[PDB]
């Protein structure tokens, strides 16, 4: 199966080292992005499938790094249906489970939270809600867990620590050496930074990151309060983690974060999640607002802003997306400058502030949506010929 | 029945005329505010509820003067329930209707959309979700409407024009001849200013809003899609109309708009609102954050910002509350800085960019939250004794 | 547009005096019934929608008597999303509103319970929810209604009463008037008959429904408290009204509805509804169970049931639908026995009190449904060629 | 902790061996039943919390034995929110889950199934919906598991099978293997009896019955098509096992199992449920209408159908409640005929076929209702002092 996107304006290629191809043509082949260019690649076309970008903008597809799920699409945090659906209308085509601390009565023991992990892995690959990637296991570390739950864990299919600290494992002097067997069998591991529920240990230190060893240093920004720019210094200058920024958090830290990795060359460490369902509520067009506010008010290049959504979010990952290259997943959004913006063009609007409208959004080459019901209405809309 | 409420660390006004009261004690009488002072207020108690501020901030309910209400507590624009009782744990004591543009078979004629302006607008003051103050029944103007149609709607309870240009009424000759029909029989009116989902007129100028001349420019900073800063200036020097600036907007034009009321002072014509339900979300925590974006980003004082929340709003739509002064409605939160932040107290809080905790919300004096479901958790939380 | 149903294998009509059609073919064209008869229908076929029933059974759509509608697809007596569809998966293609006594502060003055029914009318007309026809205002009878008001009801397109007694209006006294003026300007009006929730006046009488003159007795059987049989003797014996058996109500009452009706002649007067939402639930096979439970307890025919919830009650409110016969409109269902029932055909299967299982569900002759989600599976399923 | 209900005009014991209890009184002390009698207990009361019965009935707190739970209180099946705390308003306090085939995604190797069934079982023991004691793990069989699978279940605390058959596991032959090994580890073990959705294999006969094994056959009178009454006849005679009529079945079969179990002597048997969520519905008064329909349709005495959702149905799961009994758990329903009933009582109401109203509710002697939100009214409505 083949899918041509022709007459592309602009290519955001989600890759901080080289944000823009200078081409405006994509050839899909088989789920895979397969060739990018000009024109030449419309002769021996075949019976591809056309769309007409109509001089629009093709990004690769967004990544919510940090989504609490619970099960299918309902989120019981802010009693919401079609959650996932929502999002995938603000162009998210994968999401990253920070852990599942919605889940009603949630397991807290070993055997427990172990379970629990294993259910939501297996149980969102089984079924993409709205065909949206979920990897939706991402286990929240409790007193009691060995080395050989963590092998088991892996035996069936979990890859993912969620949020450290939001179980009864806190400190690092407990958290590392979990966080080490993890790493040993092959996880990615979140960790929660910013003000805590608990009275005596109300915050999260530099020290505490750089003792526990994270691969994500969950909410930078806070979730929603956060760690004071010393230990947003401390984490920047004395570690490699991904530094992720929330929607659900500290606009006055992300502006801090993202001006700061811009003057410390750090920017392909920022990632993007939104930190819902939580206490703040539900955005489905959380990603694409942290773009906006990042481009618009601390001075961010909007293709990389796109790259924080996407390649630098699965370059964390491991994950074969976020990057319009031969060989990654066909996952693309098509989208313009909204009615009535000041802006030309997507990226222009994305740096004016302004939400994109997104016309088409690819998953694995599938067009999953044709006109987003959430953004509003690309001036340039995309067709499907 | 009468409260008291003592041990405050700060109280801030709602009134930008004077945003910080320098008294310690309130007095709540029959769900009225009675006395703002000392401990001497504490004499001859009787069988007065106390309420123990513990040192933190007493601030007038948040109003939220952009909701997109349909009836009752069920938002079907993103599939939510219970979205009003989220909004009380965001501090929002009243709720101004936009209009109801998601009600399901919207009625588009004069006579539809008058009948369910008058529902709406009954139905809410029937039945305050929550307690919940909601002015629910915002009229959206359509052709054939005619002034008879406004002294019905008035004599039935019916005070909002909902935001212009969401009906068939959209152009400025057909509106204006409306909106002075509204303003004769004591309407408040609200105007969508910003992209809309017609191609040919795109954008809503500020001739537009000079010709119509509503009471409110709703979104200023777009819904999501924003006016020109060449726009908002000439809205700014060339009207005296209330500048709504939603959550679900444009970050960018949001701190133009203040840093340059600030200049020009006109910080008083600022008011919140969230403009959700909406393709961005739902957003209970909605109104502090905007608070907070202001205070952090865009250098106002945390004190006025909560005048943009507060006494801002309800002196636009002529509300008895919103200001803690003798005779006003007891519509009032007990708040602190939030556990970890690095802000001593709540007011630190909001200019730091945390949201603060939320312990008490009172509406007519009746507590109605004794501990924030959605905020971060309070570093000292009131207790009713 | 024309649609033929081929290879039927009982078709049942709808019409108590001639329940089964001696034929295996069905024409629709433009929306309309327009032939039935054998395999000559089929000769010059051209373009048409093919419709193989398989050997199955062919119905009409399914009434839903007595729905308590309040807007849209969202019940919130019982909190249910999307009721409607999940009702004509179980056969439902139209409902008839018994009033909104759930609508969220429901306005109970004369000017507010008009409102009301307008919008919800209006609302329903507008957007038929999964293709169903919802006819959904029905004025709930409230103190200070005038004729002026139900000449403007009528204007807006508002034609029936809701149970009577939902409302301040309860004696017969004050009901026989109004019920007087809606009768003159072409209303069908609904009498709540069973348990009140008023201790002083705790039942309905038939003097009461007899002085009342409803069209409709609405719960005959009780919604959910039945009266007596003495009573309903009474309303079966002197007066013409219909009597409606709903799902959530007294089953020992509705078998001596159901038995009586019988001896007397008097089934054509029996029609089903739910009484849901209510306290009960939502059962979106409750039409289906009324069939089967009738037929199945109370020794009524299979094909006799179908009148019940279909042309008995088309036939009291004077629906061009209903019925299985030329010029009237393409609601129809295709059905069968269930996989695993002893039963061998539709019928059979109703007759034994297995839920038969629904394969194509048509509306104005386009197919709503080609398989049901919610009854058991057909054995024989309908193809569209 | 100690609480009295007097006045109570009949108590119902939920015993089928004496299923009325000649006294007015009823003693709970610390969340169990201390002592039955008259006025002597009333002596010494001290600081008890006296509930004033007014007169009416008192019986134990109803199960329903077959619910499709798929954790916390949100069921995807229908899209319907909190409705086990709208089963607790039915007088449902403790539930047994009958597996989960609507968990999305829902995993079903044999590794998933325990995963999913154990993470159920914990979350439901940790956290009751609205105070209902759910038993919320019933694993479903999958070719795959072994009997340390099973050991490993029952050592999380999962000890229920649910209805063999919903997974990959549904020929006897593969089934009572593992059934055996459930047996072993001290599983109660379900089982789908009647029609399937296999066409090969349609329907569940008494010999697969006798061969697996199981402690309940589930939904006898179908889920919802029945097996026929040869079938029924055979497991009555041949088995002892308990023979479960649910709510969303067929009523001719529930009628004729009934009748037969009461010549047969096998009434003790006789067990309730819903059967839902399901494609019939959600209903929270599913059980009382149970009761309803057998006392007043099949000639079985009230308070013997009492029983049948109580006693008999805790006797089979071997739970210590469900009875009227010194040292059983506290949970008990204080009901009446509803208003404008024929009936006198709440046992006359149920034997006249009217849904009783519920007064008080208490799980473990705390009052959890006060008032049904989904019954009747109470004619004579129960006080807590
Ligand atoms: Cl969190
Ligand atoms: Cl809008
Ligand atoms: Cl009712
Ligand atoms: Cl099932
Ligand atoms: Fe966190
Ligand atoms: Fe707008
Ligand atoms: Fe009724
Ligand atoms: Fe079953
Ligand atoms: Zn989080
Ligand atoms: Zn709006
Ligand atoms: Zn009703
Ligand atoms: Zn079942």
Request: hydrophobic share 40%; charged share 20%.
């Given at each position: 199966?083949?899918?041509?996107?022709?007459?592309?304006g602009?290519?955001?290629?989600?890759?901080?080292?080289?944000?823009?191809?200078?081409?405006?043509?994509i050839?899909?082949?088989?789920?895979?992005?397969?060739?990018?260019?000009?024109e030449?690649?419309?002769?021996?076309?075949?019976?591809?499938?056309?769309?007409?970008?109509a001089?629009?903008?093709?990004?690769?597809?967004?990544?919510?790094?940090?989504?609490?799920?619970?099960?299918?699409?309902?989120?019981?945090?802010?009693?919401?249906?079609?959650?996932?659906?929502?999002?995938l209308?603000?162009?998210?085509?994968?999401?990253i489970?920070?852990?599942?601390?919605?889940?009603?009565?949630?397991?807290?023991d070993?055997?427990?939270?172990?379970?629990?992990?294993?259910?939501?892995?297996?149980?969102?690959?089984?079924?993409?809600?709205?065909?949206?990637?979920?990897?939706?296991?991402?286990?929240?570390?409790?007193?009691?867990?060995?080395?050989?739950?963590?092998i088991?864990?892996?035996?069936?299919?979990?890859?993912?620590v969620?949020?450290?600290?939001?179980?009864?494992?806190?400190?690092?002097?407990?958290?590392?050496?979990?966080?080490?067997?993890?790493?040993?069998?092959?996880?990615?591991?979140?960790?929660?930074?910013?003000?805590?529920?608990?009275?005596?240990?109300?915050?999260?230190?530099?020290?505490?990151?750089?003792?526990?060893?994270?691969?994500?240093?969950?909410?930078?920004?806070?979730?929603?309060?956060?760690?004071?720019?010393?230990?947003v210094?401390?984490?920047?200058?004395?570690?490699?983690?991904?530094?992720?920024?929330?929607?659900?958090?500290?606009?006055?830290?992300?502006?801090?974060?993202?001006?700061r990795?811009?003057?410390?060359?750090?920017?392909?460490?920022?990632?993007?999640?939104?930190?819902?369902?939580?206490?703040?509520?539900?955005?489905?067009?959380?990603?694409?607002?942290?773009?906006?506010?990042?481009?618009?008010?601390?001075?961010?290049?909007?293709?990389?802003?796109?790259?924080?959504?996407?390649?630098?979010?699965?370059?964390?990952?491991?994950?074969?997306?976020?990057?319009?290259?031969?060989?990654?997943?066909?996952?693309?959004?098509?989208?313009?400058?909204?009615?009535?913006?000041?802006?030309?063009?997507?990226?222009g609007?994305?740096?004016?502030?302004?939400?994109?409208?997104?016309?088409?959004?690819?998953?694995?080459?599938?067009?999953?949506?044709?006109?987003?019901?959430?953004?509003?209405?690309?001036?340039?809309?995309?067709?499907?010929?």
């Amino acid at each position: 199966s083949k899918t041509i996107i022709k007459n592309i304006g602009k290519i955001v290629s989600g890759d901080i080292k080289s944000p823009v191809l200078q081409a405006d043509t994509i050839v899909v082949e088989d789920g895979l992005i397969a060739a990018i260019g000009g024109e030449e690649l419309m002769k021996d076309a075949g019976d591809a499938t056309i769309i007409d970008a109509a001089g629009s903008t093709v990004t690769p597809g967004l990544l919510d790094t940090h989504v609490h799920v619970s099960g299918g699409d309902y989120a019981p945090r802010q009693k919401t249906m079609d959650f996932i659906s929502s999002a995938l209308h603000g162009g998210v085509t994968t999401m990253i489970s920070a852990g599942s601390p919605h889940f009603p009565g949630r397991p807290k023991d070993a055997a427990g939270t172990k379970a629990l992990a294993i259910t939501l892995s297996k149980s969102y690959y089984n079924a993409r809600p709205a065909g949206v990637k979920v990897h939706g296991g991402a286990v929240i570390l409790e007193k009691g867990l060995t080395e050989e739950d963590f092998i088991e864990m892996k035996k069936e299919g979990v890859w993912i620590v969620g949020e450290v600290g939001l179980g009864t494992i806190k400190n690092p002097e407990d958290a590392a050496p979990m966080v080490e067997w993890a790493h040993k069998h092959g996880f990615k591991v979140q960790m929660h930074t910013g003000g805590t529920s608990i009275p005596g240990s109300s915050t999260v230190t530099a020290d505490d990151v750089i003792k526990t060893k994270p691969d994500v240093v969950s909410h930078i920004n806070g979730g929603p309060t956060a760690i004071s720019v010393q230990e947003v210094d401390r984490i920047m200058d004395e570690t490699d983690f991904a530094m992720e920024i929330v929607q659900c958090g500290n606009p006055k830290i992300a502006d801090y974060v993202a001006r700061r990795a811009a003057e410390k060359g750090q920017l392909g460490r920022v990632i993007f999640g939104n930190d819902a369902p939580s206490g703040t509520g539900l955005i489905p067009l959380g990603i694409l607002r942290n773009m906006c506010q990042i481009a618009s008010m601390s001075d961010i290049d909007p293709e990389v802003a796109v790259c924080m959504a996407t390649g630098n979010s699965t370059a964390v990952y491991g994950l074969n997306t976020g990057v319009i290259a031969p060989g990654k997943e066909a996952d693309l959004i098509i989208m313009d400058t909204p009615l009535g913006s000041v802006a030309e063009d997507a990226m222009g609007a994305i740096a004016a502030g302004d939400i994109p409208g997104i016309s088409v959004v690819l998953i694995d080459g599938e067009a999953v949506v044709t006109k987003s019901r959430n953004t509003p209405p690309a001036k340039r809309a995309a067709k499907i010929l």
